[PDB]
Design an enzyme around this catalytic site. Structure first.
Site, PDB file in Angstrom:
ATOM      1  N   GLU B 370       0.501  -0.960   0.292  1.00 43.23           N
ATOM      2  CA  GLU B 370      -0.222  -0.082   0.107  1.00 43.23           C
ATOM      3  C   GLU B 370       0.558   0.958   0.470  1.00 43.23           C
ATOM      4  O   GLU B 370       0.405   2.169  -0.629  1.00 43.23           O
ATOM      5  CB  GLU B 370      -1.050   0.132   1.337  1.00 43.23           C
ATOM      6  CG  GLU B 370      -1.555   1.062   1.107  1.00 43.23           C
ATOM      7  CD  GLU B 370      -1.323   2.851   1.531  1.00 43.23           C
ATOM      8  OE1 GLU B 370      -0.429   3.144   1.971  1.00 43.23           O
ATOM      9  OE2 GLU B 370      -1.735   3.608   1.702  1.00 43.23           O
ATOM     10  N   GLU B 371       2.061   1.562   0.550  1.00 45.74           N
ATOM     11  CA  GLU B 371       2.980   2.045   0.866  1.00 45.74           C
ATOM     12  C   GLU B 371       3.306   2.743   0.074  1.00 45.74           C
ATOM     13  O   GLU B 371       3.436   4.129  -0.229  1.00 45.74           O
ATOM     14  CB  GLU B 371       3.792   1.965   1.971  1.00 45.74           C
ATOM     15  CG  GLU B 371       3.229   2.225   3.799  1.00 45.74           C
ATOM     16  CD  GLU B 371       2.488   3.121   3.598  1.00 45.74           C
ATOM     17  OE1 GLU B 371       2.963   4.927   3.501  1.00 45.74           O
ATOM     18  OE2 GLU B 371       2.158   3.524   5.675  1.00 45.74           O
ATOM     19  N   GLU B 382      -7.800  -5.182  -9.797  1.00 46.94           N
ATOM     20  CA  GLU B 382      -7.184  -5.943 -11.345  1.00 46.94           C
ATOM     21  C   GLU B 382      -7.716  -7.064 -11.795  1.00 46.94           C
ATOM     22  O   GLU B 382      -8.700  -7.900 -13.388  1.00 46.94           O
ATOM     23  CB  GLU B 382      -6.354  -5.851 -12.301  1.00 46.94           C
ATOM     24  CG  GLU B 382      -5.877  -3.656 -11.491  1.00 46.94           C
ATOM     25  CD  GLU B 382      -4.489  -3.096 -12.853  1.00 46.94           C
ATOM     26  OE1 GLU B 382      -5.308  -2.567 -13.468  1.00 46.94           O
ATOM     27  OE2 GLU B 382      -3.728  -3.596 -12.621  1.00 46.94           O
ATOM     28  N   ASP B 399      -7.289   0.627   7.871  1.00 41.76           N
ATOM     29  CA  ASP B 399      -5.846   1.361   8.039  1.00 41.76           C
ATOM     30  C   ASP B 399      -5.771   2.039   9.035  1.00 41.76           C
ATOM     31  O   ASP B 399      -6.798   1.756  10.196  1.00 41.76           O
ATOM     32  CB  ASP B 399      -5.203   2.143   6.532  1.00 41.76           C
ATOM     33  CG  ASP B 399      -3.798   2.054   6.656  1.00 41.76           C
ATOM     34  OD1 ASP B 399      -3.569   1.954   8.337  1.00 41.76           O
ATOM     35  OD2 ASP B 399      -3.316   3.208   6.228  1.00 41.76           O
ATOM     36  N   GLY B 464      -5.372   8.289  -1.647  1.00 43.31           N
ATOM     37  CA  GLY B 464      -4.755   7.807  -0.270  1.00 43.31           C
ATOM     38  C   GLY B 464      -4.332   6.707  -0.054  1.00 43.31           C
ATOM     39  O   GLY B 464      -3.670   6.607   1.564  1.00 43.31           O
ATOM     40  N   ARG B 480     -14.687   4.204   5.484  1.00 39.48           N
ATOM     41  CA  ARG B 480     -13.309   4.066   6.623  1.00 39.48           C
ATOM     42  C   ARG B 480     -14.667   4.558   7.904  1.00 39.48           C
ATOM     43  O   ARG B 480     -15.121   5.902   7.988  1.00 39.48           O
ATOM     44  CB  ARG B 480     -12.176   4.287   5.508  1.00 39.48           C
ATOM     45  CG  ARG B 480     -12.755   5.885   5.339  1.00 39.48           C
ATOM     46  CD  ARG B 480     -11.659   7.046   4.497  1.00 39.48           C
ATOM     47  NE  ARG B 480     -10.209   6.911   4.454  1.00 39.48           N
ATOM     48  CZ  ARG B 480      -8.958   7.031   5.215  1.00 39.48           C
ATOM     49  NH1 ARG B 480      -8.315   7.983   4.332  1.00 39.48           N
ATOM     50  NH2 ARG B 480      -7.832   6.340   5.587  1.00 39.48           N
ATOM     51  N   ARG B 482     -12.104   5.999  11.706  1.00 38.82           N
ATOM     52  CA  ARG B 482     -11.060   5.847  12.729  1.00 38.82           C
ATOM     53  C   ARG B 482     -11.259   7.117  13.998  1.00 38.82           C
ATOM     54  O   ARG B 482     -12.118   7.857  14.054  1.00 38.82           O
ATOM     55  CB  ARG B 482      -9.841   6.188  11.908  1.00 38.82           C
ATOM     56  CG  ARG B 482      -9.542   7.605  11.704  1.00 38.82           C
ATOM     57  CD  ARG B 482      -8.200   7.628  11.036  1.00 38.82           C
ATOM     58  NE  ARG B 482      -7.861   6.838   9.726  1.00 38.82           N
ATOM     59  CZ  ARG B 482      -6.446   6.779   9.322  1.00 38.82           C
ATOM     60  NH1 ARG B 482      -6.057   8.128   9.485  1.00 38.82           N
ATOM     61  NH2 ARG B 482      -6.953   5.698   8.441  1.00 38.82           N
ATOM     62  N   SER B 572     -25.392  26.440 -19.019  1.00 36.39           N
ATOM     63  CA  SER B 572     -26.783  26.712 -18.174  1.00 36.39           C
ATOM     64  C   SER B 572     -26.361  25.026 -17.466  1.00 36.39           C
ATOM     65  O   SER B 572     -25.487  24.394 -17.947  1.00 36.39           O
ATOM     66  CB  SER B 572     -27.732  26.720 -19.120  1.00 36.39           C
ATOM     67  OG  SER B 572     -29.511  26.272 -18.403  1.00 36.39           O
ATOM     68  N   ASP B 608     -30.348  -5.938  -5.967  1.00 31.13           N
ATOM     69  CA  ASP B 608     -29.003  -5.600  -6.995  1.00 31.13           C
ATOM     70  C   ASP B 608     -29.544  -4.321  -7.497  1.00 31.13           C
ATOM     71  O   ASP B 608     -28.608  -3.115  -7.318  1.00 31.13           O
ATOM     72  CB  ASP B 608     -29.952  -6.763  -8.282  1.00 31.13           C
ATOM     73  CG  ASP B 608     -29.395  -7.659  -8.209  1.00 31.13           C
ATOM     74  OD1 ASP B 608     -28.638  -7.761  -6.792  1.00 31.13           O
ATOM     75  OD2 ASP B 608     -29.593  -8.181  -8.489  1.00 31.13           O
ATOM     76  N   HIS B 631     -15.401   6.970 -11.139  1.00 33.25           N
ATOM     77  CA  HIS B 631     -16.974   7.245 -10.783  1.00 33.25           C
ATOM     78  C   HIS B 631     -16.917   9.309 -11.047  1.00 33.25           C
ATOM     79  O   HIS B 631     -15.894  10.427 -11.211  1.00 33.25           O
ATOM     80  CB  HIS B 631     -17.026   7.765  -9.083  1.00 33.25           C
ATOM     81  CG  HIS B 631     -18.238   7.291  -8.583  1.00 33.25           C
ATOM     82  ND1 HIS B 631     -18.512   8.718  -8.058  1.00 33.25           N
ATOM     83  CD2 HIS B 631     -18.140   6.099  -7.533  1.00 33.25           C
ATOM     84  CE1 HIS B 631     -19.686   8.286  -7.223  1.00 33.25           C
ATOM     85  NE2 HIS B 631     -19.522   7.124  -6.985  1.00 33.25           N
TER      86      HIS B 631
HETATM   87  O1  2G5 Z   1       0.117   6.346  -2.467  1.00 28.01           O
HETATM   88  C1  2G5 Z   1      -0.760   6.283  -2.178  1.00 28.01           C
HETATM   89  O2  2G5 Z   1      -2.236   7.132  -2.257  1.00 28.01           O
HETATM   90  C2  2G5 Z   1      -1.149   6.370  -0.245  1.00 28.01           C
HETATM   91  C3  2G5 Z   1       0.489   5.522   0.161  1.00 28.01           C
HETATM   92  C4  2G5 Z   1       0.504   6.051   2.104  1.00 28.01           C
HETATM   93  N1  2G5 Z   1      -1.190   6.088   2.497  1.00 28.01           N
HETATM   94  P1  2G5 Z   1      -0.690   5.802   3.983  1.00 28.01           P
HETATM   95  O3  2G5 Z   1       0.128   6.426   4.219  1.00 28.01           O
HETATM   96  O4  2G5 Z   1      -1.062   4.604   4.663  1.00 28.01           O
HETATM   97  O5  2G5 Z   1      -2.341   6.499   4.443  1.00 28.01           O
HETATM   98  C5  2G5 Z   1      -2.408   8.202   4.118  1.00 28.01           C
HETATM   99  C6  2G5 Z   1      -3.367   8.238   3.708  1.00 28.01           C
HETATM  100  N2  2G5 Z   1      -3.471  10.472   5.010  1.00 28.01           N
HETATM  101  C7  2G5 Z   1      -5.048  10.142   4.788  1.00 28.01           C
HETATM  102  O6  2G5 Z   1      -6.643   9.768   5.071  1.00 28.01           O
HETATM  103  C8  2G5 Z   1      -5.582  12.063   5.008  1.00 28.01           C
HETATM  104  C9  2G5 Z   1      -6.651  12.427   4.621  1.00 28.01           C
HETATM  105  C10 2G5 Z   1      -6.518  13.879   4.741  1.00 28.01           C
HETATM  106  C11 2G5 Z   1      -5.527  14.832   5.380  1.00 28.01           C
HETATM  107  C12 2G5 Z   1      -4.551  14.720   4.923  1.00 28.01           C
HETATM  108  C13 2G5 Z   1      -4.219  12.927   4.656  1.00 28.01           C
HETATM  109  C14 2G5 Z   1      -4.519   8.153   5.926  1.00 28.01           C
HETATM  110  O7  2G5 Z   1      -3.926   8.094   6.994  1.00 28.01           O
HETATM  111  O8  2G5 Z   1      -5.354   6.708   5.561  1.00 28.01           O
HETATM  112  C15 2G5 Z   1       0.976   7.524   1.354  1.00 28.01           C
HETATM  113  O9  2G5 Z   1       0.060   8.641   1.537  1.00 28.01           O
HETATM  114  O10 2G5 Z   1       1.466   8.221   1.696  1.00 28.01           O
HETATM  115 CA    CA Z   2      -1.731  -3.602 -12.865  1.00 28.66          CA
HETATM  116 CL    CL Z   3      -8.956   3.857   7.174  1.00 26.94          CL
HETATM  117 ZN    ZN Z   4      -1.184   2.869   5.526  1.00 21.85          ZN
HETATM  118 ZN    ZN Z   5       1.677   5.476   5.146  1.00 20.48          ZN
END
Ligand code: 2G5
Ligand code: CA
Ligand code: CL
Ligand code: ZN
Ligand code: ZN
Ligand SMILES: *[C@@H]1O[C@H](CO)[C@@H](O[C@@H]2O[C@H](CO)[C@@H](O[C@@H]3O[C@H](CO)[C@@H](O)[C@H](O[C@H]4O[C@H](CO)[C@@H](O)[C@H](O)[C@@H]4O)[C@@H]3O)[C@H](O)[C@H]2NC(C)=O)[C@H](O)[C@H]1NC(C)=O
Ligand SMILES: *[C@@H]1O[C@H](CO)[C@@H](O[C@@H]2O[C@H](CO)[C@@H](O[C@@H]3O[C@H](CO)[C@@H](O)[C@H](O[C@H]4O[C@H](CO)[C@@H](O)[C@H](O)[C@@H]4O)[C@@H]3O)[C@H](O)[C@H]2NC(C)=O)[C@H](O)[C@H]1NC(C)=O
Ligand SMILES: *[C@@H]1O[C@H](CO)[C@@H](O[C@@H]2O[C@H](CO)[C@@H](O)[C@H](O)[C@H]2NC(C)=O)[C@H](O)[C@H]1NC(C)=O
Ligand SMILES: *[C@@H]1O[C@H](CO)[C@@H](O[C@@H]2O[C@H](CO)[C@@H](O)[C@H](O)[C@H]2NC(C)=O)[C@H](O)[C@H]1NC(C)=O
Ligand SMILES: *[C@@H]1O[C@H](CO)[C@@H](O[C@@H]2O[C@H](CO)[C@@H](O)[C@H](O)[C@H]2NC(C)=O)[C@H](O)[C@H]1NC(C)=O
Ligand SMILES: *[C@@H]1O[C@H](CO)[C@@H](O[C@@H]2O[C@H](CO)[C@@H](O)[C@H](O)[C@H]2NC(C)=O)[C@H](O)[C@H]1NC(C)=O
Ligand SMILES: *[C@@H]1O[C@H](CO)[C@@H](O[C@@H]2O[C@H](CO)[C@@H](O)[C@H](O)[C@H]2NC(C)=O)[C@H](O)[C@H]1NC(C)=O
Ligand SMILES: *[C@@H]1O[C@H](CO)[C@@H](O[C@@H]2O[C@H](CO)[C@@H](O)[C@H](O)[C@H]2NC(C)=O)[C@H](O)[C@H]1NC(C)=O
Ligand code: 2G5
Ligand code: NAG
Ligand code: NAG
Ligand code: NAG
Ligand code: NAG
Ligand code: NAG
Ligand code: NAG
Ligand code: CA
Ligand code: CL
Ligand code: ZN
Ligand code: ZN
Lengths: 692, 692
Positions: B370-371, B382, B399, B464, B480, B482, B572, B608, B631
């Site tokens: 993910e990172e 996919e 997360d 992200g 999500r 948290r 419009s 459905d 979307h």
């Molecule tokens: O490559 C990507 O699209 C993201 C990879 C990686 N995601 P991760 O660090 O696990 O999560 C960041 C993500 N940040 C946000 O949701 C967030 C939302 C609003 C403002 C600032 C940050 C989270 O806290 O879930 C990153 O942001 O470096």
């Molecule tokens: Ca691929």
């Molecule tokens: Cl999350």
């Molecule tokens: Zn994360």
């Molecule tokens: Zn992260």
């Protein structure tokens, strides 16, 4: 009892005859008042017949028409600029129609305007290989020339695309007696052959599934935002016009330059068929001049959409659709099809009035503007794409019911093969010498399968008709059936898109008793009946596994013409054969479960797996530079919209590959398409695995 | 009884604490042995816990790592080429971890290699408006300069994209105490603040939803055909490296040229925050030099996929997914989330061992990589896209469970709003001063909705994180939740992606009793429980109608800043407001039918319709130049991947429109996007009409 036999027995030849007569007395050109009035008549009658709802769905789309006060024609012009010969302004009308108004003169729909003047080059059928032969073998250059091509072999839009890429400044299309005059048969009105004054109308677009040239991706509704003309999809850049063989002879007879390269370039006229460029000695200062003044015009079109709501699964749709617009009278194309649809609606309605309803919903459609590029079916499918992709069981097309009187023709997805075999074994043959025998028996005898003894030929779907959006864009199982000629002793039928294609043509020469029409109504209506009523959807996934292997063998054999390149670039088909093997194994297991499970959830889970199987062959990224052809197993041939091609992404990557200047890049793209095809086959297979 | 209360009561704070400890003792960097061993441990334990199947799904994807024997660093270099100051080679490790191996030094993943040398320009947060201010207002030219930017406000990949388009030859990212040091709190290990030596790792890709840079559209499986590096998706073209504020101060303190334009450009260091370019008088001949030697490497990654088969609808999937790979120890990100998933699986399994099964199938996922750009979730989606789009009910992300200890945060589709409100009214608040009160009450009190009295704030999804492929590509309802900080008295949390983000950070400073973790497990697990068990799917289409109106009002207001252009080009919004009105009316009627119908077919037809409603907002052609954002209502902001934008196609067409040189073309594209949005809203509405 309300069963298939009740539905089939209600269908009547005499009704189909009455409806064909009713539909073919005046022209029904797309976008005209007459065709809107016919739409309203169909709508009213379908309600009368008993459908639950019948609505018109209208769109505003780009159409093309000649200018009534500035006619299109072609000339031979001498060095002083005098026009010494002119092609005809109209086809001599048939007996008793000489006073009919609003017969559109022959033209090529969507030609731009122009008056180009130049030397002729004869390009045979204007196929990709004809241009290869001219340019590569004969060293003849088409740049700045007017090309003359004979109709036949491929879709006329592909001819124009090929001419345009060769640098031509205009295209003349003509009907050669070799391709449109059967030996020993008289011309219309005394037989079914094309007279010297007859001319084939037709559009020359290269839409690649886009629908209305101005609104690709979205319905052409009231608030649609339209591309400008210069950004429209599929329009030709050079003028184009069609002529008959009396006029063609006057244009060809003087041709000079090089001789035809071989006999396959010679038609049946008494001319040398010299390729050119230009005319022989004494006429070398004469030129050919086109005068085209047709105009493209955004115009309203109307589909009729009839609904017969399902009793048990109203959210599952079986669609029977065919077009209503015609070039002139539409005696065969499309009214022989539309009259059959009309009798099918009437029969389904008779049962509905007695309290019956199909298990699933049936939709009936009368499409508009098919002749201008499948516009009506495509816009409606764009509007309704979300409903169709989550609810669409099958689409059965219903254009021309007859193009001959010899035997059945069926083109369809492999998922329908078993349905078609079983249905035709239950229908009576209408053929002389087969009385008391099944349609399956007469069909199999006259049109044997190339690979299996005791089975009939069924072809893959190409395009050039209204199933295109449903099958190649949306991935809905599709089929078609009609009566056809004996291909061994015969190019469609001679009077195609001419003023001579009338009710009398059909009634006198094709099907006097309407028994071939009735047999086709039984086949199309029976397919619809089974699709809409069978508890388990009548699709056999194992038939897809068999063809996938045949197509994989075929594409591998094409690649194997280049063994050194395959070694050099490490081109392997192993993944595709592995995917096909896995599909075969998984399909076989799914079929066992389907045979081995009143628990309506397992049934419906399993009907959903059947319904979404065709859907699984769709790639949402589309094929290269053709985003509306998304089916990875089948697409219309890039050289001929009428023909289907299997594994089209790999096929096009391999085509003429020895002439690519960067072989590493070309072979890399072959390997990319192998990966996409193997992945899609495995992904489709996995939709048939146990769901959890 | 096996009901939601049984599921919720089985969840234990002490278990979550044990699992977090277990998951955070060593680094689990994507592609490393340690993270593969953790995947195998999770797989074994999920089987033990009672799941029906638990498999690893592996892919070979592009990753990025520093070179262990040629470290990355930045210098100030004098006119003789001597490096007079060097940034740190690693963060000082925290107490008791000074002997831990395999801590990756700070780096920006996917930076190219290089050693560029030049004058610094300070660009604040490197946002679109920061560059507008530099170039347009201050007349400062970034071409050929090294830019230094502070982290915060937007996704770091957007910063790099913006720097690259301004012509920068490299980017230095740093953490300013203004954004990562809360007043009155001590730095780690004595508090939760970032020390001067701490550094934020993270990728700097601009993938726009593509997944693995080498295989957009298709899973990176064993036979995948990979793009060459020069054609890869989303890689930066200039070197990039992150530093802490002790090192940043040494780089900023000498900066000359122009003063900061205003106070919003000044952080908390004792430096002028001059923009540059270059250093003041005496140091004007010194330059900054980067040394980056990281390498991109195709590497194997492993997702864990656990299945709990549904009793009644096994072909409907509710997915709970979150990632397992971490930059270092992952004390918060992601192991605070993964420990919660682990306890949820354990609880569901306890009920399963007693004979219970959910109505629908539940899938549990531990995503890898993910990172490095959401790679594991995206490749698996996919691979499985056909199954997910025809069977996917909902995706709940999992997360980081905590980024503060103040109140709940929820971002989700409007289809889940009512579910979330109802669930939180049944859960106990863990907050001091709210004992005996519901989570709904404490949440609503601390985070009121901006538009409705007595309701809490719920935000739209940005990106992200791993829900991106499911929501913005495939159109599966996603959510999500948290625990978060008080945004009024506080930029994520200070120790984000630093070596200091440890088990001890969480246990000492965030959640000693693990009661916030437990509350988040109840929210995420309760959402999953209701989605997977409720007879009627717990989605309220009327909540979508309310937000669609708010977003239409918002986009119309943006356009209305340009009234003369709207008059000139006849722009419009009538069609969009009409579509939203129709959606409102149709949704209201559907809700009545849903309330007013044991006939499992009507129920499932109606489930459905609920499931495919999110799906109806997908446009298969995607948004302009972003084909994996499909979307039409929501996409990640083109200026900040973390933030969601509503009606993104129209928003981007209007953005900075006054600076476009061809206003006719620009306003034409605004009108095109209005048409696409109105059509998609009406099309989604029509999926809720009676089906026949
Ligand atoms: O490559 C990507 O699209 C993201 C990879 C990686 N995601 P991760 O660090 O696990 O999560 C960041 C993500 N940040 C946000 O949701 C967030 C939302 C609003 C403002 C600032 C940050 C989270 O806290 O879930 C990153 O942001 O470096
Ligand atoms: Ca691929
Ligand atoms: Cl999350
Ligand atoms: Zn994360
Ligand atoms: Zn992260
Ligand atoms: C048709 O279905 C079959 C299943 O019956 C399916 O077989 C799968 O093939 C893949 C790809 O070949 C196998 O992948 C292997 O998986 C193991 C772990 O389980 C890996 O260790 C292997 O990688 C090593 O070896 C490779 C090959 O030499 C090296 O390139 C690599 O660097 C590693 O050293 C490899 O990834 C997979 O295990 C089977 N699955 C089974 C048997 O269940 C086949 O893929 C399907 N066909 C298609 C086209 O999908
Ligand atoms: C929201 O839902 C409503 C339905 O409740 C839906 O209303 C539809 O609006 C369209 C487009 O405005 C209407 O289209 C008209 O249809 C009639 C035939 O039924 C035509 O004759 C009209 O065309 C004439 O007038 C036009 C407008 O001045 C001219 O441009 C044109 O050249 C013709 O002279 C026109 O096409 C349609 O009838 C209604 N349907 C109803 C009321 O049932 C509305 O479209 C939905 N909103 C969205 C965004 O989809
Ligand atoms: C085709 O058949 C239709 C349907 O019978 C005919 O239309 C009807 O004409 C009669 C007599 O003019 C009217 O009273 C009805 O209102 C019409 N019914 C409709 C339109 O549903 C039509 O005349 C026939 N056309 C031809 C050319 O024979
Ligand atoms: C072919 O058609 C053209 C166009 O009508 C004829 O040429 C025109 O003849 C009229 C009357 O003689 C002249 O006034 C026009 O100036 C001519 N127009 C052009 C464009 O040349 C021509 O005579 C016809 N040729 C034949 C052999 O019938
Ligand atoms: C076509 O007809 C055949 C022969 O009746 C059908 O195959 C039979 O189907 C039944 C019901 O599942 C099985 O018990 C038999 O074993 C099958 N016989 C075979 C394979 O020889 C076949 O299903 C029909 N195809 C359809 C309806 O699409
Ligand atoms: C995290 O917990 C797991 C599961 O209890 C531990 O892995 C087990 O370790 C014991 C003792 O070495 C072995 O006998 C088991 O085979 C392991 N079980 C597995 C992998 O499922 C692991 O030691 C713990 N890790 C840490 C760092 O505490
Ligand atoms: C910053 O790091 C560099 C690289 O290690 C140091 O410069 C090197 O010093 C060694 C030993 O004195 C020389 O032999 C190398 O040639 C130098 N390399 C380069 C690229 O200059 C440098 O001294 C360090 N600077 C400070 C202030 O610590
Ligand atoms: C959230 O809870 C409310 C209140 O119980 C639910 O709304 C009720 O649903 C029932 C069952 O259809 C109706 O009879 C009531 O009229 C509803 N009360 C209202 C609207 O105030 C609502 O459905 C729940 N939302 C979910 C489950 O997504
Ligand atoms: O624009 C399009 O794609 C097709 C429009 C129009 N279709 P239409 O004339 O109604 O039907 C032609 C179509 N032709 C074929 O199927 C065909 C198949 C094989 C060889 C030659 C012709 C048919 O007979 O169904 C045309 O071909 O001009
Ligand atoms: C058709 O031709 C006439 C007569 O020459 C001309 O005046 C008119 O503009 C044309 N109509 C068009 C181009 O639509
Ligand atoms: C064909 O003719 C034109 C000369 O008018 C030229 O520009 C073009 O390159 C020629 N093509 C070939 C293949 O000779
Ligand atoms: C109808 O069939 C007969 C008998 O084979 C044949 O002679 C005639 O040519 C056919 N008509 C058409 C239009 O094919
Ligand atoms: C890492 O740096 C070393 C030592 O200078 C070098 O020899 C090696 O090639 C590098 N590894 C890479 C580029 O993967
Ligand atoms: C910025 O600087 C470079 C000169 O090195 C120049 O090429 C570029 O056009 C400049 N841009 C502006 C907006 O002045
Ligand atoms: C936990 O909550 C307390 C009380 O408001 C606060 O002082 C402390 O800063 C919080 N811890 C974190 C990490 O936010
Ligand atoms: Ca369109
Ligand atoms: Cl047909
Ligand atoms: Zn037709
Ligand atoms: Zn036709």
């Amino acid at each position: 009892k309300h069963n298939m036999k009740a539905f089939l027995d209600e269908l009547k030849a005499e009704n189909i005859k009455k409806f064909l007569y009713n539909f073919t007395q005046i022209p029904h050109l797309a976008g005209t008042e007459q065709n809107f009035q016919l739409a309203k008549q169909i709508q009213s009658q379908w309600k009368e017949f008993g459908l639950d709802s019948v609505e018109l769905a209208h769109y505003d789309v780009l159409l093309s028409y000649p200018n009534k006060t500035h006619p299109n024609y072609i000339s031979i012009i001498n060095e002083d600029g005098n026009e010494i010969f002119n092609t005809s302004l109209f086809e001599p009308p048939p007996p008793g129609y000489e006073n009919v108004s609003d017969i559109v003169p022959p033209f090529s729909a969507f030609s731009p305007q122009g008056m180009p003047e130049g030397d002729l080059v004869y390009v045979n059928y204007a196929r990709t290989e004809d241009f290869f032969k001219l340019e590569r073998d004969m060293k003849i250059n088409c740049s700045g020339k007017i090309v003359i091509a004979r109709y036949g072999k491929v879709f006329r839009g592909n001819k124009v695309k090929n001419a345009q890429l060769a640098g031509a400044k205009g295209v003349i299309l003509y009907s050669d007696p070799a391709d449109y005059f059967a030996p020993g048969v008289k011309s219309y009105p005394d037989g079914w052959n094309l007279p010297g004054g007859g001319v084939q109308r037709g559009n020359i677009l290269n839409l690649n599934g886009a629908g209305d040239p101005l609104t690709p991706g979205y319905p052409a509704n009231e608030y649609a935002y339209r591309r400008g003309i210069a950004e429209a999809v599929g329009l030709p850049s050079i003028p184009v016009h069609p002529i008959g063989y009396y006029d063609a002879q006057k244009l060809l007879e003087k041709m000079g330059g090089s001789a035809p390269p071989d006999s396959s370039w010679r038609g049946s006229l008494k001319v040398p068929y010299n390729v050119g460029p230009g005319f022989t000695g004494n006429f070398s200062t004469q030129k050919v001049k086109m005068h085209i003044h047709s105009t493209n015009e955004v115009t309203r079109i109307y589909n009729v959409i009839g609904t017969l709501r399902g009793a048990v699964e109203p959210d599952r749709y079986v669609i029977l659709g065919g077009h209503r617009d015609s070039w002139v009278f539409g005696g065969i194309d499309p009214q022989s099809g539309a009259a059959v649809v009309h009798e099918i609606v009437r029969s389904f309605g008779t049962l509905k009035k007695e309290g019956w309803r199909p298990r699933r919903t049936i939709l009936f459609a009368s499409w508009d503007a098919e002749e201008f590029g499948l516009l009506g079916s495509t816009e409606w499918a764009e509007e309704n794409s979300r409903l169709l992709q989550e609810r669409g069981v099958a689409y059965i097309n219903a254009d021309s019911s007859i193009e001959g009187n010899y035997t059945l023709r069926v083109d369809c997805t492999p998922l329908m093969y078993s349905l078609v075999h079983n249905l035709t074994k239950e229908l009576k043959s209408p053929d002389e010498g087969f009385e008391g025998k099944s349609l399956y028996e007469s069909w199999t005898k006259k049109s044997p399968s190339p690979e299996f003894s005791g089975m009939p030929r069924i072809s893959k779907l190409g395009s050039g008709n209204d199933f295109e959006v449903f099958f190649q864009r949306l991935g809905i199982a599709s089929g078609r059936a009609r009566y056809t000629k004996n291909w061994e002793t015969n190019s469609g039928y001679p009077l195609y898109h001419s003023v001579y294609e009338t009710y009398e043509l059909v009634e006198k020469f094709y099907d006097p008793m309407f028994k071939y029409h009735l047999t086709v109504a039984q086949v199309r209506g029976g397919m619809v009946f089974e699709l809409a009523n069978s508890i388990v959807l009548p699709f056999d996934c194992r038939d897809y596994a068999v063809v996938l292997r045949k197509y994989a063998d075929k594409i591998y054999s094409i690649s194997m013409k280049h063994p050194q390149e395959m070694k050099t670039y490490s081109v392997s088909f192993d993944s595709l054969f592995s995917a096909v093997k896995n599909f075969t194994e998984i399909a076989s297991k799914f079929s066992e479960r389907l045979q081995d499970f009143s628990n309506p959830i397992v049934l419906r889970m399993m009907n959903d797996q059947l319904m979404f199987l065709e859907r699984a062959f769709i790639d949402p990224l589309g094929l290269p530079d053709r985003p509306f052809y998304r089916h990875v197993i089948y697409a219309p041939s890039s050289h001929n919209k009428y023909a289907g091609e299997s594994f089209p992404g790999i096929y096009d990557a391999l085509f003429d590959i020895e002439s690519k200047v960067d072989p590493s890049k070309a072979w890399g793209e072959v390997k990319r398409q192998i990966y996409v095809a193997a992945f899609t086959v495995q992904a489709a297979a996995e939709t048939l695995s146990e769901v959890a």
